[PDB]
Design a protein around this ligand. Structure first.
Ligand code: HEM
Ligand code: HEM
Ligand code: HEM
Ligand code: HEM
Lengths: 141, 146, 146, 141
């Protein structure tokens, strides 16, 4: 669980993402769509081609929610409350899907932060994504 | 495990550039650090108390290289991953009793290691391609459970 | 998917006693109730608001019977689950895009349904045997993803 | 997550298990060992044959911990604290293993409570086991 060093590690890595959080959000989406084709089934309404603005715009929304979790690490349940009701009841996202996106999100950070994606950071970040996943699937859970 | 010509290039080309001596232990060490239950598989390897201890552990470094060979050798028998991995499966299944889920874990950490190392070259498509392979190997390796 | 003679008996013998008309919908309804994301696959089936609504849903009852046929037909082609399931895999993979994990879920709920129905007859060994089969089918069915 | 009807459903099903909680614990262990051979790897020291007392005795310990979770549903994290440190650090139980045992535990209740193992109960009970699982793997988590 998010020990104080974890807390520290995430804030630290989140920090060096800064103004590109949104862009990284998009990239992570793109990665998911291609490596995990089945996930495309939740976005019938979108153009999933490279440069889709639908995707870019949805990448800032993803980045916006992780930023709020990061800022309220110690109380994510409450903060992501809203988002849980949406992914759980509205959409019925299959929980496996949460791990595929956490996975593409790690692949993008590793791709953008050679300095900072050290083993301890990775581990911490992995642990953060599992917690957000766990919250987004709390209706079910 | 078809893989189009276009995906077949993505793949060997970058693997062309891979540090065979390094990345193997980068991957296995990261495995042990990130999902530590896995550390129950190499208690014999020595010091694993922390990430620093894990990552310099020469036993980790050594074993990592054999594991990559195994991927390389798979990357060269794609249309026959079962045969090519028969030996190891039996090893991971009948002797060691490793849950197949950990083969997915290793392949994913392996992709994170390649992104880390290649950056901007590890585009979405290259990843999509690598994910395929990695999916292949874990299935080849779990083959002995069904 | 070897299965010893002793496990081969456990299996057909009890299946001998199975309500083909009932249990199929018992299993599918339980699926939709227990892991409701799955309800995204049968929105067309009508009312699924609650368990009562789910379990009487005649569309659920109907579809359940075809699913058991599919297990029966598998239970009779064990050494060839790939061929026997080729058709359905393509259906569940290329059209529907169902994550393979749900095939494990259905087989496990299927075993819970058989325990429920058989009681004291559903001994550990019989289960061990059924788990094998069920493991088989989910793999046969996910075959098209690798 | 454990809504009030869930809370109700579990207490209800736990209630009809009464004096056999321990015996059901054993049976559930036996089931796991046979259907999931790999799990046997955490009990080198045990005789896993049918009538093992090692297994019977370990079945009462399993039942004893679920009884305490049931009784402190609303605050399991704290109560199973101890047990978490044991399965996470001491033993390094692979998390997949948690689902296999929740699974055999459901198969045993269904086998012993035809009346009560209705679809809503099952669902509730499933949800309870996931929560205990989630707690036992919190070190990792
Ligand atoms: C780390 C986990 C995730 C977070 C933080 C997250 C965040 C969000 C946010 C902030 C929204 C609302 C954006 C808006 O209001 O349009 C949303 C919507 C949505 N999410 Fe997620 N999401 C996550 C994972 C996933 C997964 C795994 C899936 C499916 C594979 C998914 C599918 C969707 C869909 C289908 C919608 C509605 C999209 C639309 O209609 O435009 N999300 N998500
Ligand atoms: C797809 C992934 C994997 C590949 C390609 C792979 C490959 C290998 C190879 C090449 C060896 C050397 C056997 C020898 O020592 O000659 C080996 C051994 C070993 N594997 Fe893996 N492995 C994989 C995943 C795993 C995982 C996930 C674990 C545990 C979590 C594991 C546990 C072991 C252990 C403990 C040994 C070494 C002791 C011995 O066998 O001498 N393997 N593996
Ligand atoms: C191992 C388990 C499974 C078996 C043996 C199986 C078998 C079947 C069969 C026999 C059909 C009938 C196709 C037709 O309508 O002729 C079918 C269709 C269907 N399957 Fe499954 N299935 C399995 C798992 C799943 C799961 C887990 C889901 C979703 C969570 C699912 C989603 C669907 C849907 C939505 C249809 C019906 C619409 C249509 O295809 O006409 N299946 N399946
Ligand atoms: C619902 C989840 C579970 C609960 C409530 C639970 C409960 C317990 C309890 C109460 C103990 C201590 C008994 C004593 O003090 O001897 C214990 C020990 C142990 N558990 Fe679990 N357990 C669970 C799941 C598992 C799983 C999934 C595994 C591995 C597959 C496992 C393996 C072990 C082992 C190896 C020990 C030490 C046994 C010994 O040395 O005698 N348990 N468990």
């Amino acid at each position: 669980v998010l020990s104080p060093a974890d807390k520290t590690n995430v804030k630290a890595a989140w920090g060096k993402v800064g103004a590109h959080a949104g862009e990284y959000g998009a990239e992570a989406l793109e990665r998911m769509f291609l490596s995990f084709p089945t996930t495309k089934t939740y976005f019938p309404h979108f153009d999933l081609s490279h440069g889709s603005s639908q995707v870019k715009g949805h990448g800032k929304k993803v980045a916006d929610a992780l930023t709020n979790a990061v800022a309220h690490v110690d109380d994510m349940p409450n903060a992501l409350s809203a988002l849980s009701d949406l992914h759980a009841h509205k959409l019925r996202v299959d929980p496996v899907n949460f791990k595929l996106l956490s996975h593409c999100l790690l692949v993008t950070l590793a791709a953008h932060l050679p300095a900072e994606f050290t083993p301890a950071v990775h581990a911490s970040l992995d642990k953060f994504l599992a917690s957000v996943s766990t919250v987004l699937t709390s209706k079910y859970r | 495990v078809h893989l189009t010509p276009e995906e077949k290039s993505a793949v060997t080309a970058l693997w062309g550039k891979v540090n065979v001596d390094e990345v193997g232990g980068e991957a296995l060490g990261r495995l042990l650090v990130v999902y530590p239950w896995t550390q129950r598989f190499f208690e014999s390897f020595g010091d694993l108390s922390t990430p620093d201890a894990v990552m310099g552990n020469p036993k980790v470094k050594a074993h990592g290289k054999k594991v990559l060979g195994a991927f390389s050798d798979g990357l060269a028998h794609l249309d026959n991953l079962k045969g090519t991995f028969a030996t190891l499966s039996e090893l991971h299944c009948d002797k060691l009793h490793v849950d197949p889920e950990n083969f997915r874990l290793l392949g994913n950490v392996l992709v994170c290691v390649l992104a880390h190392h290649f950056g901007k070259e590890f585009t979405p498509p290259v990843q999509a391609a690598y994910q395929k392979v990695v999916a292949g190997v874990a299935n080849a390796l779990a083959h002995k459970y069904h």
